Amino acid sequence: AEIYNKDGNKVDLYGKAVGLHYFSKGNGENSYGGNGDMTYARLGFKGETQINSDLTGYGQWEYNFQGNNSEGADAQTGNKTRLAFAGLKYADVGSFDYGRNYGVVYDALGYTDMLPEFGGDTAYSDDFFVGRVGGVATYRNSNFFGLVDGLNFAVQYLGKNERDTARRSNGDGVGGSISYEYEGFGIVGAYGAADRTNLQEAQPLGNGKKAEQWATGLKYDANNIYLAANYGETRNATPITNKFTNTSGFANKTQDVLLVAQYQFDFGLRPSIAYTKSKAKDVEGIGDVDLVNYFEVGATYYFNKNMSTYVDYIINQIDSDNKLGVGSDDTVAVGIVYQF
Amino acid sequence: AEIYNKDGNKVDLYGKAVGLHYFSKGNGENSYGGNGDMTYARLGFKGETQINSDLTGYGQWEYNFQGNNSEGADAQTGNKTRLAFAGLKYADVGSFDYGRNYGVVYDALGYTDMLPEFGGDTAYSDDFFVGRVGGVATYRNSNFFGLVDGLNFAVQYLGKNERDTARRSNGDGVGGSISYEYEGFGIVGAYGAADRTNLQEAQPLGNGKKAEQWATGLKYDANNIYLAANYGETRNATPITNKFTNTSGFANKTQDVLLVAQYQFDFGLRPSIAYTKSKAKDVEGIGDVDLVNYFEVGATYYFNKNMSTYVDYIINQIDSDNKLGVGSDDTVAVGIVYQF
Amino acid sequence: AEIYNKDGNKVDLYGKAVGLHYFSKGNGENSYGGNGDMTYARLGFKGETQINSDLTGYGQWEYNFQGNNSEGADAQTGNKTRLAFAGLKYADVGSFDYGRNYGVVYDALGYTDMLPEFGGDTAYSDDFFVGRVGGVATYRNSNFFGLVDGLNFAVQYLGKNERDTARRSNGDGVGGSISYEYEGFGIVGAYGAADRTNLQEAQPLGNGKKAEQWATGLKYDANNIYLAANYGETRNATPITNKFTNTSGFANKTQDVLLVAQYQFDFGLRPSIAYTKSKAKDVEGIGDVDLVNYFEVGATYYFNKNMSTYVDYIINQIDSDNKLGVGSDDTVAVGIVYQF
């Protein structure tokens, strides 16, 4: 909600309280999304100041407060800053920002990250260019310097992040995306490569000294209809764990597919149908193994722009004999959202 | 403070900075409330949107930031989300919400949870239905579908919460309350029973496979006067610890009494007089033991709706030979509150 | 930004998103400020209510959210509440507040704590009276009860804080400051002494049962010019660590000097030139050792009151043979700030 706007500076303080519950059989240990209370809230701010007619400065911060912990020792479990960056946009020259933000490959994966509760399985956090990462400098251009309507691109520099964990670490890298949007249609191409850290290389699964990720996307977004598809691959970038051996590392290779079809009725109901499959190739020891594989059926009902509720149902196609231990059970999520 | 209100959506961003200090002799280890700096702040939001004339959606989140930690490793000690839920209210049919919220038995204990700094001793957190808990779905009805002014009720479904700790855990359960309010008077009855988790049962103190809590309350609230009384009992629900043995578990049984009398002068001064006593019965090993037992004398002075200060004084009646190790010393709390 | 103001109560919700990066050679282990992403954000509130013409109540809370952690286990690293206090100001009688706030000696050190990114090296946190500490009651008087324009003073009572760490602990103490400001000029004197805790005394470095800190400051602040200088000393108060032995404690004695000269051009550019040197004396084992020693050259460019960027460059004068292991490499900080 825009709580402030004076002297060319406008601040939008936003947030949401999400009452959420997952239903899966057993201890949800073998299910797709788990089981139980998953309630949470978000708080963030987006600021934008007009320094003059061509120049705009802006900043954004977003935080995640879990609502399913006790007030005891586990109280902070899952809390984290999702985004934190500042930047400038100049006339038709482009924008530049730095901080914790979305990797450029997400410029593609965003196409199908539209499910009510699940979806966007390949857009992992602190995983190079596919989701939110820290220390990325991003330049973005719209309408090719204003010369070509609908043609945009971006280049992104990722700085080394040597964390205590191989999963949350990364070396230096560069990535970019090019997308084009013409009347309801949009097509995107995104790619990034980076160095892997010592610790990443010391891992049992995955082999290489460079991580890569690329994805392409296609969409039709107009007339209440939303159809989107993504296809991408990765080398030594996707994190995996052998639940049996309790081993961990990255998938030498993956081929990922995501499709989504939804429709927005005028009365508020937005049904969703999706399909996702991510398969790893050459996993040291297992060979080829599916990591994600399911159908989704779900629906969101918007009471208005501040209130909604939904049910997301995952029909897991993973099979009980999956070599890595990936769960095969279904999961149903029900949620009630208030937001501003 | 209502910082936003447009298009049927109003957001109230609220909070407070509480400069607080406890005075108890010794290292406050044997006193009622401890000793030293207890400064803290709160931040939360309450949103409410009119979806149409009969339907209202709403949400709320509240957080606790301790102000008495260092900027070092202990910086997060005591921080936590207190409430996080979303819901809908429909005409005279009732309201329904889900998330981290207050158990239904608190519909009763709330009567006497009015002391300046202390009080409300039996309304523990993550303790079934008496205080704030996670994963509770609550239905509330006001004025019996609009047919009976002053007659309200509520039913609440608590979902299993298997935490790493027996104290912060719970199995499934149901609870409800019925209350009636007629011209300054109010009477309430509340009750809930739930399953105890494996871990709760593996504890040294307390024996059973079901937890129960009920409380009744009576109050006279009008003419600057506030008198209230609560009486309730519990089975295997109240957490206790033998400081000697360093043993822990739940009280097989407890009988709790709370009384409160206060008066609000027109100039801002609100004196308080209270009495609290919670005694455990059949504690495995000790027999009957008091857990809480004191008189309170205190006062709050309101400068206005945003500023106040108070002194709360606990005259501990617990005795030095208390079998569980419960402290017997007095405690005086002084505080200065700014809030919005 | 003042988001609320009605009925004599005004709330200012403020914050900033700082995209920040440090450049130092090596693993920045031997450099002055480290190396890598240092992005962060701040959120806080300052409230003030007019209780009547002479009386004002107020409160403030400020938090620090690190933007350079992963969304993993390290997500909370560096997060903390910086300030949390409430108070009252009465006519010309003075103000009084309690909570986590700045020690009185900072009334002096504040003079030179003006560098774009670094500086203020001696104003440590949870270090008695020099920076932010918890549990301090502060009385401040302006214009000597309104009888002497420009003459102010303050006295501060620090309550014992026995933390798990010798570095973040303190015993009781008192401190005060007196300052005078006449037309661009300002002079200050500040001093405080406190008890050291058992744990502080059990430390390998430093010897005494009382901690002291005093600093004097002088400044010329007017005509776009800002020149300031501080000189102060301390006994058993400054924390130090022998990187070789991995020993820790406090410096028996230190003599600290800080100078700063800056100029604010009308177009937005504010160049900075500074010099800092803190040397410890009688360190048990080493003798005399520099703790801080460098020149700073830097500049901030203000696009407007909400947006700025800067480069701060530290020309470290510490030498590679420094007995404590203090780093000798240079550090360059670049940052982009959005704030409201």
Q: How far apart are CA B56 and CA A37, in angstroms?
A: 24
Q: How far apart are CA B143 and CA B181, in angstroms?
A: 10
Enclosing H/E stretch for C135: strand C132-141
Instruction: Give bridge partners of residue A310 from the DSSP assignment.
Output: A300, A335
CB C196 within 8 A of CB C205: no
Q: In whole angstroms, how large is the CA radius of gyration of chain B?
A: 21
Instruction: Give bridge partners of residue C88 from the DSSP assignment.
Output: C57, C96
CB A156 within 8 A of CB A192: yes
Q: Is there a contact between A165 and C73 if contact means CB atoms under 8 Å apart? A: yes
Longest dimension (CA), chain C: 62
Q: How far apart are CA C161 and CA B74, in angstroms?
A: 13
Among C78, C105, C167, C120, which Cα is nearest to C292's? C120
Length of chain A: 340
Q: Which residues of B touch C9 (CB under 8 A)?
A: 1, 305-306, 340
CB B13 within 8 A of CB B45: yes
Cβ burial of A244 (10 Å; 0-12, 13-18, 19+) is exposed
Among A3, A32, A19, which Cα is nearest to A329's? A32
Token pair recorded at residue C75: 């997500």
C78: DSSP letter = T
Enclosing H/E stretch for A323: none
HSE-CB of C23 using CA atoms within 13 angstroms: 8
CB B82 within 8 A of CB B62: yes
Question: How far is the CA of B111 from the CAs of B129, B260, B310, in angstroms?
Answer: 15, 9, 20
Other CB atoms within 10 Å distance of the CB of residue B90: 13
Instruction: Give bridge partners of residue C17 from the DSSP assignment.
Output: C41, C338
Among C6, C313, C123, C289, which Cα is nearest to B340's? C6
Question: How far is the CA of A131 from the CAs of A100, A277, C70, in angstroms?
Answer: 10, 18, 12
Q: How far apart are CA B234 and CA B175, in angstroms?
A: 13
For B338, nearest residue in chain C (alpha carbons): C59
Q: How far apart are CA A315 and CA A25, in angstroms?
A: 13
Q: Are strands B225-235 and A185-195 parallel, antiparallel or unpaired?
A: unpaired
C112: DSSP letter = G
A154-158, long-range: CB < 8 A, 24+ apart: A154/A104, A154/A107, A155/A104, A156/A103, A156/A104, A156/A129, A156/A192, A158/A103, A158/A128, A158/A129, A158/A133, A158/A192, A158/A194
Interface probe, candidates B50, B100, B125, B133, chain A, greatest A C-beta count within 10 A: B100
Q: How far apart are CA C89 and CA C190, in angstroms?
A: 22
Enclosing H/E stretch for B122: none
Q: At A11, which amino acid appears?
A: V
Token pair recorded at residue A215: 């994805």
Q: How far apart are CA B170 and CA B156, in angstroms?
A: 14
Q: Which residues of A touch B8 (CB under 8 A)?
A: 304
B61 Cα distance to chain centroid: 16
State residue C35 phi and psi, 5-degree precision.
Answer: -160, 145
CB B139 within 8 A of CB B156: yes
Q: How far apart are CA A308 and CA B248, in angstroms?
A: 43
Q: How far apart are CA B240 and CA B202, in angstroms?
A: 15
B28-61 core/surface letters (b: 16 or more CB in 10 A; e: else): bebbbbbbbbbbbbbbbbbbbbbbeeebbbbbbb
Q: At B156, which amino acid appears?
A: Q
Interface probe, candidates B85, B139, B156, chain A, greatest A C-beta count within 10 A: B85
Q: How far apart are CA A262 and CA A115, in angstroms?
A: 9
Residue from the list C47, C76, C135 with its beta carbon closest to the beta carbon of B68:
C135
CB C33 within 8 A of CB C22: yes
Q: Is there a contact between A43 and B47 if contact means CB atoms under 8 Å apart? A: no
Q: Which residues of A touch B (CB under 8 A)?
A: 1, 3, 13, 15-19, 21, 36-37, 39-41, 43, 65-76, 303-307, 336-340
B110-138 core/surface letters (b: 16 or more CB in 10 A; e: else): bbbbbbbbbbbbbbbbbbbbbbbbbbbbb
Among A209, A205, A207, A140, which Cα is nearest to A178's? A140
Nearest CA-CA distance, residue B142 and chain A, Å: 22
Question: How far is the CA of B191 from the CAs of B83, C266, C293, in angstroms?
Answer: 21, 70, 67
Residue from the list B8, B80, B135 with its beta carbon closest to the beta carbon of A75:
B80
Chain B partners (3+ C-beta pairs within 8 A): A, C
Nearest CA-CA distance, residue A81 and chain B, Å: 15
Instruction: Give bridge partners of residue A29 from the DSSP assignment.
Output: none
∠C315-C319-C322 over CA atoms, to 5°?
135
Report helix, strand or coil for A324.
Answer: coil
HSE-CB of B56 using CA atoms within 13 angstroms: 15
Q: How far apart are CA A312 and CA A335, in angstroms?
A: 9
Other CB atoms within 10 Å distance of the CB of residue C297: 14
Report helix, strand or coil for C330.
Answer: coil
DSSP character string of A280-299:
EEEETTTEEEEEEEEEEEEE
Other CB atoms within 10 Å distance of the CB of residue B148: 11
Instruction: Give bridge partners of residue B102 from the DSSP assignment.
Output: B132
HSE-CB of B336 using CA atoms within 13 angstroms: 19
C193-213 core/surface letters (b: 16 or more CB in 10 A; e: else): bbebbeebbebebbeeeebbb
Cβ burial of C135 (10 Å; 0-12, 13-18, 19+) is buried
Q: Which residues of C touch A (CB under 8 A)?
A: 1, 3, 13, 15-19, 21, 36-37, 39-41, 43, 65-76, 303-307, 336-340
Q: How far apart are CA B131 and CA B105, in angstroms?
A: 8
State residue A32 phi and psi, 5-degree precision.
Answer: -65, -50
CB C207 within 8 A of CB C284: yes
Q: Are strands A80-90 and A94-102 parallel, antiparallel or unpaired?
A: antiparallel
Q: Is there a contact between C306 and A9 if contact means CB atoms under 8 Å apart? A: yes
CB C36 within 8 A of CB C22: yes
Q: Are strands C94-102 and C55-66 parallel, antiparallel or unpaired?
A: unpaired
Q: Is there a contact between B39 and C134 if contact means CB atoms under 8 Å apart? A: yes
Residue from the list B60, B84, B164 with its beta carbon closest to the beta carbon of A65:
B84
Chain A partners (3+ C-beta pairs within 8 A): B, C
Residue from the list B3, B39, B303 with its beta carbon closest to the beta carbon of C4:
B3
Place of tokens 């209230």: B228
Other CB atoms within 10 Å distance of the CB of residue C129: 34
Q: Is there a contact between C87 and B18 if contact means CB atoms under 8 Å apart? A: no
Method: X-ray
Q: How far apart are CA B273 and CA B261, in angstroms?
A: 5
Nearest CA-CA distance, residue A307 and chain C, Å: 24
Q: How far apart are CA B203 and CA A283, in angstroms?
A: 44
CB B99 within 8 A of CB A19: yes
Helices marked H in chain B — which ranges? 106-109, 143-146, 198-201
Sign of the torsion angle spanned by Cα atoms C123, C124, C127, C131: positive
Other CB atoms within 10 Å distance of the CB of residue A121: 20
State residue B97 phi and psi, 5-degree precision.
Answer: -145, 160
Token pair recorded at residue B248: 């822990």
Among A21, A60, A59, A20, which Cα is nearest to A43's? A60
Nearest CA-CA distance, residue A304 and chain B, Å: 6
Interface probe, candidates A45, A53, A124, chain C, greatest C C-beta count within 10 A: A45
Q: Are strands B94-102 and B132-141 parallel, antiparallel or unpaired?
A: antiparallel
Report helix, strand or coil for A198.
Answer: helix
Q: How far apart are CA B259 and CA A197, in angstroms?
A: 64
∠C184-C189-C191 over CA atoms, to 5°?
150
Q: Is there a contact between B3 and C8 if contact means CB atoms under 8 Å apart? A: no
Q: How far apart are CA C228 and CA C214, in angstroms?
A: 17
Q: How far apart are CA C161 and CA C132, in angstroms?
A: 13
Q: Is there a contact between B55 and A303 if contact means CB atoms under 8 Å apart? A: yes
Q: Where are the beta strands (DSSP E) in C286-330?
A: 287-302, 307-316
Question: How far is the CA of B328 from the CAs of A35, B38, B292, B322, in angstroms?
Answer: 44, 20, 10, 8
Place of tokens 């005259």: B315
Q: How far apart are CA B269 and CA A330, in angstroms?
A: 59
Nearest CA-CA distance, residue B182 and chain A, Å: 33
Q: Which residues of B touch C (CB under 8 A)?
A: 1, 3, 13, 15-19, 21, 36-37, 39-41, 43, 65-76, 303-307, 336-340
Enclosing H/E stretch for C231: strand C225-235
Enclosing H/E stretch for A145: helix A143-146
Q: How far apart are CA B124 and CA A279, in angstroms?
A: 48
Report helix, strand or coil for B69.
Answer: coil
Question: How far is the CA of A119 from the CAs of A41, A123, A240, in angstroms?
Answer: 19, 9, 18
State residue B205 phi and psi, 5-degree precision.
Answer: -100, 140
Question: How far is the CA of A235 from the CAs of A192, A193, A249, in angstroms?
Answer: 11, 9, 12
Q: How far apart are CA B262 and CA B340, in angstroms?
A: 24
Cβ burial of B173 (10 Å; 0-12, 13-18, 19+) is buried
Q: How far apart are CA B180 and CA A126, in angstroms?
A: 54
Token pair recorded at residue A259: 């499709």
Token pair recorded at residue A68: 């399913």
Among B27, B15, B91, which Cα is nearest to B53's? B91
Other CB atoms within 10 Å distance of the CB of residue A34: 16
CB A115 within 8 A of CB A99: no
Among C66, C50, C67, which Cα is nearest to C58's? C50
Token pair recorded at residue C333: 């900080």
Say which CATH superfamily domain C1-340 falls into: Porin (2.40.160.10)
Q: Is there a contact between B165 and A73 if contact means CB atoms under 8 Å apart? A: yes
Q: How far apart are CA B176 and CA B158, in angstroms?
A: 11
Q: Where are the beta strands (DSSP E) in chain A?
A: 2-6, 9-23, 36-37, 40-50, 55-66, 80-90, 94-102, 132-141, 151-158, 173-182, 185-195, 210-222, 225-235, 239-242, 247-250, 253-263, 269-283, 287-302, 307-316, 331-339
Q: How far apart are CA C56 and CA A161, in angstroms?
A: 48
Breaks (C-N over 2.5 A) in chain A follow: none
Residues 6+ apart with CB under 8 A from C198: none
Q: Are strands B331-339 and A239-242 parallel, antiparallel or unpaired?
A: unpaired
Cβ burial of B241 (10 Å; 0-12, 13-18, 19+) is middle
Among C98, C103, C69, C64, which Cα is nearest to C84's? C98
Among C236, C254, C234, which Cα is nearest to C197's? C236
Among B94, B233, B108, B258, which Cα is nearest to B179's? B108
A164: DSSP letter = S
How many helices, marked H, and strands, marked E, lie in chain C?
A: 3, 20
